Design an enzyme around this catalytic site. Structure first.
Site, PDB file in Angstrom:
ATOM      1  CG  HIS A  75      43.145  54.640  44.566  1.00 18.51           C
ATOM      2  ND1 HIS A  75      43.767  54.813  43.466  1.00 18.51           N
ATOM      3  CD2 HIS A  75      42.309  53.576  44.575  1.00 18.51           C
ATOM      4  CE1 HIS A  75      43.467  53.688  42.932  1.00 18.51           C
ATOM      5  NE2 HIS A  75      42.600  53.152  43.196  1.00 18.51           N
ATOM      6  CG  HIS A  77      43.154  49.940  44.846  1.00 10.65           C
ATOM      7  ND1 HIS A  77      41.902  50.031  44.339  1.00 10.65           N
ATOM      8  CD2 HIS A  77      42.873  49.237  46.121  1.00 10.65           C
ATOM      9  CE1 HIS A  77      40.975  49.347  45.264  1.00 10.65           C
ATOM     10  NE2 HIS A  77      41.768  49.010  46.125  1.00 10.65           N
ATOM     11  CG  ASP A  79      45.288  51.314  40.027  1.00  6.02           C
ATOM     12  OD1 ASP A  79      45.209  51.519  41.225  1.00  6.02           O
ATOM     13  OD2 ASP A  79      44.114  51.279  39.164  1.00  6.02           O
ATOM     14  CG  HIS A 137      37.936  52.923  42.880  1.00  9.38           C
ATOM     15  ND1 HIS A 137      37.681  51.734  42.449  1.00  9.38           N
ATOM     16  CD2 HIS A 137      39.222  52.909  43.232  1.00  9.38           C
ATOM     17  CE1 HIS A 137      38.917  50.953  42.077  1.00  9.38           C
ATOM     18  NE2 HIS A 137      39.639  51.764  42.956  1.00  9.38           N
ATOM     19  CB  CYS A 156      40.064  54.042  40.330  1.00 11.95           C
ATOM     20  SG  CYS A 156      41.937  53.842  39.583  1.00 11.95           S
ATOM     21  CE  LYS A 159      37.078  52.592  37.757  1.00 11.15           C
ATOM     22  NZ  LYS A 159      36.755  52.148  39.025  1.00 11.15           N
ATOM     23  CG  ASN A 165      38.468  45.990  42.720  1.00 10.81           C
ATOM     24  OD1 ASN A 165      37.759  45.364  43.108  1.00 10.81           O
ATOM     25  ND2 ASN A 165      39.832  46.372  43.289  1.00 10.81           N
ATOM     26  CG  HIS A 195      41.455  51.895  35.107  1.00  8.87           C
ATOM     27  ND1 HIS A 195      42.522  51.428  35.059  1.00  8.87           N
ATOM     28  CD2 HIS A 195      41.079  51.805  36.359  1.00  8.87           C
ATOM     29  CE1 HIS A 195      43.344  51.269  36.353  1.00  8.87           C
ATOM     30  NE2 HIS A 195      42.353  51.297  37.206  1.00  8.87           N
TER      31      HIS A 195
HETATM   32  O1  LIG Z   1      40.965  48.919  41.521  1.00 11.68           O
HETATM   33  C1  LIG Z   1      41.503  49.434  40.712  1.00 11.68           C
HETATM   34  O2  LIG Z   1      41.936  50.584  40.911  1.00 11.68           O
HETATM   35  C2  LIG Z   1      41.495  48.560  39.444  1.00 11.68           C
HETATM   36  C3  LIG Z   1      42.094  47.120  39.974  1.00 11.68           C
HETATM   37  C4  LIG Z   1      43.397  46.885  39.835  1.00 11.68           C
HETATM   38  C5  LIG Z   1      43.824  46.408  38.504  1.00 11.68           C
HETATM   39  C6  LIG Z   1      45.438  46.048  38.720  1.00 11.68           C
HETATM   40  C7  LIG Z   1      46.169  46.126  39.772  1.00 11.68           C
HETATM   41  C8  LIG Z   1      45.504  46.847  40.906  1.00 11.68           C
HETATM   42  C9  LIG Z   1      44.315  47.137  40.843  1.00 11.68           C
HETATM   43  O3  LIG Z   1      46.605  46.828  41.767  1.00 11.68           O
HETATM   44  C10 LIG Z   1      47.799  46.460  41.225  1.00 11.68           C
HETATM   45  O4  LIG Z   1      47.586  46.214  39.905  1.00 11.68           O
HETATM   46  C11 LIG Z   1      40.099  48.559  38.888  1.00 11.68           C
HETATM   47  C12 LIG Z   1      40.552  48.279  37.282  1.00 11.68           C
HETATM   48  C13 LIG Z   1      39.237  48.053  36.258  1.00 11.68           C
HETATM   49  C14 LIG Z   1      38.785  46.776  36.253  1.00 11.68           C
HETATM   50  C15 LIG Z   1      37.464  46.653  35.408  1.00 11.68           C
HETATM   51  C16 LIG Z   1      37.063  47.669  34.998  1.00 11.68           C
HETATM   52  C17 LIG Z   1      37.305  48.879  35.237  1.00 11.68           C
HETATM   53  C18 LIG Z   1      38.464  49.219  35.681  1.00 11.68           C
HETATM   54  O5  LIG Z   1      36.490  49.758  34.474  1.00 11.68           O
HETATM   55  C19 LIG Z   1      35.418  48.927  33.875  1.00 11.68           C
HETATM   56  O6  LIG Z   1      35.791  47.634  34.109  1.00 11.68           O
HETATM   57  C20 LIG Z   1      39.356  49.527  38.885  1.00 11.68           C
HETATM   58  O7  LIG Z   1      39.860  50.731  39.035  1.00 11.68           O
HETATM   59  O8  LIG Z   1      38.071  49.656  39.278  1.00 11.68           O
HETATM   60 ZN   LIG Z   2      41.506  51.230  42.730  1.00 10.41          ZN
HETATM   61 ZN   LIG Z   3      42.273  51.528  39.197  1.00  8.52          ZN
END
Ligand SMILES: O=C(O)[C@@H](Cc1ccc2c(c1)OCO2)[C@H](Cc1ccc2c(c1)OCO2)C(=O)O
Ligand SMILES: [Zn+2]
Ligand SMILES: [Zn+2]
Ligand SMILES: [Zn+2]
Length: 220
Positions: A75, A77, A79, A137, A156, A159, A165, A195
Site C-alpha cells: 500500500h 504508506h 511503512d 485500511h 496493514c 488488525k 490509523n 503491526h
Molecule cells: O497507517 C499505517 O500504515 C500505520 C501508521 C504509520 C506509522 C508509521 C509511519 C507511517 C504510517 O508512515 C511512515 O511511518 C498504522 C500503524 C498503527 C498504529 C496504531 C495501531 C496499529 C497500527 O494497530 C493497532 O493500533 C496502521 O497501519 O494502522
Molecule cells: Zn498504512
Molecule cells: Zn501500517
C-alpha cells in the site's frame, strides 16, 4: 537511536523482516514485511520504513549469495514504501499497483518502477500472488499469498485488536472486504500482519469483527 532491524526465518524460503519507527502519537511502531526466497533469488514483500534499513536488509541477503530480484509494496504508506527510492537507485525492480503508484505520485513520493492491474497479479507464477480484497485500511491495500507454504502477508489490512490509523481508511467498505478475504484465504496456515505478530486464519475473523465494530462505532 531506534531498535535494530530484525531478520528471522518463518518457514523454508520465507523470512520476516521487522523495522521500527517513532511515528505520531503511537510511540515506536514495529513493522513486519517478508523476504521470499526463489532459488537463487530473493523478493521483498514491503520495504522497511527507511533507506538505511532497506540497504541493511538487502546487504544481508546479497552477502549470502542472494541477489535481490525485486520488491512489492502492499500500500502507499511509508511503512510499506519507504525503501523504493533507495531500491530504484540500485537498479532493483520495484512493484506496486497502478492505484498505489497514483497515490504515491499525488503525495509527492517516488513511484515503483513497475505497475500492475487486476485483482490477482502473479509476481512469480505459482509462488507469489498479489490480491485486492477491496478497500479498508486504505483504498489500495492488497495482500500477498504464498502457495508453497500457504502463508498470507496481510499488511496493514489485518488488525485483530483495533483498526489503527484511520486517516485514509474506508470503514464503510472494510467489513465487506474482510469477508471476501476471509473466504479466499481460509486455508492460510500462517497470516502475517504489519503491526501485530504472526497468527493463523483466526486473524482473518478477528479483523472482520473489528471492522464491523468500528463501523458500528462510527454511527454513534
Ligand atoms: O497507517 C499505517 O500504515 C500505520 C501508521 C504509520 C506509522 C508509521 C509511519 C507511517 C504510517 O508512515 C511512515 O511511518 C498504522 C500503524 C498503527 C498504529 C496504531 C495501531 C496499529 C497500527 O494497530 C493497532 O493500533 C496502521 O497501519 O494502522
Ligand atoms: Zn498504512
Ligand atoms: Zn501500517
Ligand atoms: Zn514482530
Amino acid at each position: 537511536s531506534l531498535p535494530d532491524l530484525k531478520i528471522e526465518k518463518l518457514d523454508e524460503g520465507v523470512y520476516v523482516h521487522t523495522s521500527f519507527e517513532e511515528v505520531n502519537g503511537w510511540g515506536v511502531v514495529p513493522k513486519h514485511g517478508l523476504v521470499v526466497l526463489v532459488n537463487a533469488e530473493a523478493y521483498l514483500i514491503d520495504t522497511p520504513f527507511t533507506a538505511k534499513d532497506t540497504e541493511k536488509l538487502v546487504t544481508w541477503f546479497v552477502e549470502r549469495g542472494y541477489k535481490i530480484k525485486g520488491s512489492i509494496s502492499s500500500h502507499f504508506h511509508s511503512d510499506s514504501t519507504g525503501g523504493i527510492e533507495w531500491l530504484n537507485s540500485r537498479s532493483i525492480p520495484t512493484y506496486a499497483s497502478e492505484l498505489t503508484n497514483e497515490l504515491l505520485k499525488k503525495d509527492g513520493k517516488v513511484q515503483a518502477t513497475n505497475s500492475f492491474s487486476g485483482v490477482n497479479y502473479w509476481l512469480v507464477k505459482n509462488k507469489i500472488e498479489v490480491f485486492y480484497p477491496g478497500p479498508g485500511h486504505t483504498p489500495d491495500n492488497v495482500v500477498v499469498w504464498l502457495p508453497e507454504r500457504k502463508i498470507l502477508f496481510g499488511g496493514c489490512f489485518i488488525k485483530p485488536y483495533g483498526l489503527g490509523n484511520l486517516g485514509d481508511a474506508n470503514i464503510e467498505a472494510w467489513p465487506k472486504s474482510a469477508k471476501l478475504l476471509k473466504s479466499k484465504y481460509g486455508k492460510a496456515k500462517l497470516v502475517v500482519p504489519s503491526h501485530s505478530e504472526v497468527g493463523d486464519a483466526s486473524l482473518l475473523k478477528l479483523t472482520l469483527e473489528q471492522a464491523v465494530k468500528g463501523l458500528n462505532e462510527s454511527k454513534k
